[PDB]
């Protein structure tokens, strides 16, 4: 936000006055917006100055393209955009300037229309000549003639419409777009945007315990799985459309959180070594390779705690939390070594467990030290903490963040949530996990199969990043103690194998539905975007309705979802017609990616959802028109 | 907003990321707020660092090349609020100039330990020594008197003698208080330094009266008006003083141009002997540093200013930067004008307003030149005792110009104040305010509905850090259709709205006389405007006959003077009242705790009753509390609760200005709070 002959103000995207960069992915249309003004009726304009700086990640805590900007409905507010083409730091700046030809074009096309004579139009014409002559200076010598001829024409004697003809022409208009006469160019402030690989914003996660991939012996007793049986587990997870496979720690406490373990109990998985029963570093290397061949990524948990008997407890003075204060340099250097080790082992995704319990400046340093060395490493923060810290950690450079989504159950909670996630889109990318081996929500506990499908739609559509724990597809809703948020017989304390193949064959698996959800996502680029979520009024406290669009392709999707998993719910859906790139009186066609149903729709549309037939409607909304798709993206 | 071992974020008051300072006046309690956090359950705290830099006004915008011109750090505590991780502070600047606040964030180890050593509800525990270790450290930060408290406390928990209750000293009140004044601060993260330009109180709180000196002349025995002087104008002042207005604003007192002189009722050609527009500054007699010959001399004016000072009034001159075709600059410096190809100076305009009698100045051709001359002119009147300027459509002149001029003036003399008459888009309006314009003219004149006024009042309180408004009930160019049809009731309604809502309010003469005559039907311009003819008024007669708002405007000013609440802007809270043509709002002083509540009808014809719903904790109370009130309009007392029945007869009185129960000290500051 600057002040000169031209004033530039309230520029976006600015993050905490500029202490941190904005978040983006390669291919994302980043909308920019600034308040630009000057004196009098005189014309003003703005240029968006975008520059790439490479893959140099900045340390966030103490331990050239010239693109045009168009004005909008909101006076004195100009809007711009850009689509970064590679991972790295890009910087936008807003150049403000007076537009004398724009002014002249208007103030003279007015008089010459409509319909004044050569006498009263003589002066403005001769000034227009002075401008084209001035503008010509900015045009390379080989392209000038057009302008000079045009200028000499206005000063030649005759009829206003004939004189102004050349200056008003297309040839000139185009040429002036490429080389404009920009007066009093005021340079705005430089602002950063860290651009990440698309998997940072759009990715479907599947959490799986490798030890539970074991199966059973002919007797019925479970087998402790290896990286090999886990590698065998992968193709259905691949076939379900998940692209990230998150494993809990691969490095006492007994069955169902009991303080003393019975001999032969598995123990809780929660630093540069693999579990002997799982395999070797070589076995894991093979596991990672197997995942890559299926087009899957591996995500490891980076939990920074020690069991009382850890090598660090003895060497560098059921869990011990680490102390970052006594020997900062020491711990800082070892964590970095550990993380680098797995990066070297083909792991480019880390799920940082409870970051809010560890120093903010630590994360910043670690996130930075890694990202400079290799910018493709991504970090997800499992911070279920106050919003200050949650978003605070995201600003620090955490790629994605775990959200309040599981406790957002009501229509109103969900709208407030969806709206908030779209608002904080520049500072945080959310990961909506339907639940975790730590979180079994009371809604799912009583709602049954319908509930599981409802939540999966909500997460998969609303969240560009969504996740499922192993077993969600088998409707795992049995809670340990009544009212507890923990699972009965948690996979964390025992070998929990599952015959998914059987469930599917019997028809007791959400496995096919989760696939459709991922197919829909893959097909619809609108489900990738976050900022474009808009809610639409559906009159029924049990139904929820929201849209989304891709500013690049114009793809539009509308979701209509029941929150009652037992009985059917009907209502009238009222569409914000221009929001979807239309007029209120317009009528269009829609395809339901769920049922395959096709219908003519208007502003007001009757809707009915039977949780026996399908919990939601994922409509294929008419493609947003090019000119309307940037207007719709707009900030102010 | 910073990042370190402690994170400081979403700090307020920040203006355009810090490009411009926040607005304040001496005695104003400035609330500060920040989001401060750290890791885990460990204790965090914040310190507000206030530093004075003197009366050095900063240049806020990049000026053109060639254009020349010319302590004891407070550490104040920040308490947390209802909103987690948000700390709140405040400060009252005692001396006019630049002030800078910073938010220091830090870990509180004793706070942590205090909590962690409870635990007491037991043994074995010899962290009762890490506590001793802390108090011993903390003691270093305490002056060698009152450090004893801490040493005794530490030595106590270091003593083996008896239970873990030897730590009672460390946990004590005496210690807790002492540690508030001199805390043990870990990992002190210094936040961003943010400016606040503190002005003299007349910048925020002042009542203006606009008067044309030429119109103070009176009539001859034949009925024809007489052209007034600075002497007759000096005579018209005491009633303006008696009405409680402290600022007397005069339109240009400069020789009006003879060339292209506009005649009666905006007629393009003037009849012989027509007065002409005061805003067409400059004839053969003089320019912008000269007085109108018919008004008097520089000496006459000096006497006029002195007369105003003796009545406790201060003069506000109009700073209009245009020239009549016959101005001294038009002959001497045609490089300050936009000479068209045909060799003529461009005629002045402001869509839909055309000004055939003026030439607008050109700031681009010779920037250094014009910049230096405007300064000279403004300095001239400052030297003549004028410390207030009512700037004419500043939005028509360069932004960087204003910034440079306001700066160049305030460095030399920080007491000079500038009011922007910018009726333009909000971007530019507030934009100019951020640039350093002391007060701004508002959309107030067209905010008629209950909705419009609540949306307005709320907006003015929101933009309070970047702009101080001046609510003028009417101007010699603004005669609103509300006033044209509403009759005397309307006049009173608007005056209440302006005087209460706006810490700065204004009245243009003839208003106390209910002048509703508009030139053309539906036009906002006055029939027979004072700008083109000598419009004298016998105020004394009207008062006597019974057609003067003169006594009511005085009560409004008395009320204002008595109530420090009607000075503060940010504290405007609207209270729900069922009638849609009735409005209710509060205001409080964060220093004195004074509370005022206004209940005003917008229907000037018939009476309006309704049930008033109070946001009880906002008046520093609980919902089932029941208090007493004293109307400043009626004088008497009434029993009021959370819900109160109200009735307003515009025949009896258009509004109720209640003297609400004084807000309790501890509650005062929570009602001020930002987040
Ligand atoms: O040429 C002088 C010009 O003066 C008046 O215009 C004033 C306006 O009335 C005031 O409100 C002031 O703040 O701005 C204008 C300055 O030009 C007359 O209205 C106008 O006809 C006349 O030409």
Residue numbers in the entry:
A (entry chain A): 0 to 62, 88 to 275, 282 to 300, 309 to 355, 378 to 696
B (entry chain B): 0 to 69, 86 to 136, 143 to 696
What does the paper say about this structure?
In an attempt to obtain a maltosyl-GlgE intermediate state, GlgE was co-crystalized with maltose-1P. We could not observe the maltosyl-GlgE intermediate but instead we found maltose bound to only one of the active sites of the dimer. The fact that maltose was present instead of maltose-1P is most likely due to GlgE slowly degrading maltose-1P to maltose, since maltose-1P was free of maltose contamination and we confirmed its stability at different temperatures for long periods of time. Significant conformational changes were however visible in the structure especially in the S domain of the protomer with bound maltose. The S domain of this protomer exhibits conformational changes with several residues of α1 (V132–L136) and α2 (S146–150) losing their helical conformation. Moreover, all four helices comprising the S domain of the maltose-bound protomer were found to be shifted with a maximum distance of ~6.5 Å when compared to both the maltose co-crystallization and the apo structure. This brings domain S of the maltose containing protomer closer to loop 2 of domain B of the “apo” protomer. Unfortunately, the majority of domain B, including loop 2 and the antiparallel β-strand lid, is not seen clearly in the maltose-1P co-crystallization structure “apo-protomer” and thus it could not be modeled.
GlgE is a maltosyl transferase that transfers maltose from a maltose-1-phosphate (maltose-1P) donor to α-(1–4) glucan chains. GlgE is essential for M. tuberculosis and its depletion leads to pleiotropic stress effects and eventually cell death. GlgE is proposed to catalyse the transfer of maltosyl units to α-glucan chains through a double-displacement reaction in which an aspartate residue acts as a nucleophile forming an β-maltosyl-enzyme intermediate, while a glutamate residue is thought to protonate the phosphate and deprotonate the acceptor, acting like an acid/base catalytic residue16. Each of the protomers of M. thermoresistibile GlgE contains 5 domains and 2 inserts that have been described extensively in the first reported GlgE structure and therefore we will focus on the particular characteristics of M. thermoresistibile GlgE.
